[PDB]
Design a protein around this nucleic acid. Structure first.
Length: 69
RNA sequence: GGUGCUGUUUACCAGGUCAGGUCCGAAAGGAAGCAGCCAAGGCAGCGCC
């Protein structure tokens, strides 16, 4: 279960904007995304790093709730 | 080395285009620009010089 998936699922259009600013590898291995990449993605989708982390925060809980069934 | 071809490879770090999103604006409209893609580079094979 990756971010390509999480995508298939005003605050929603902005949640796509962010993933839309990532690369295939970042969607395939979210963990590889540290500060530098966060920065690239925030500016790339007119957001703020906090916003991204937020989106990253969600996927994590969503993924975590995927390793429980 | 250069050059052509082919395969491969490359988040951002003065290429181009720029979905999506963002910014400025009452608006008309401007602006920057991620991913992609094209280009360019890297690693190689073959040919040519």
């Amino acid at each position: 279960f990756d971010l390509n998936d999480f995508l298939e699922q005003k605050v929603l259009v902005r949640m796509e904007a962010i993933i839309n600013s990532m690369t295939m590898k970042e969607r395939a291995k979210p963990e590889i995304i540290k500060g530098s990449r966060k920065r690239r993605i925030a500016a790339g989708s007119g957001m703020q790093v906090q916003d991204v982390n937020r989106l990253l925060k969600q996927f994590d809980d969503m993924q975590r709730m995927m390793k429980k069934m």
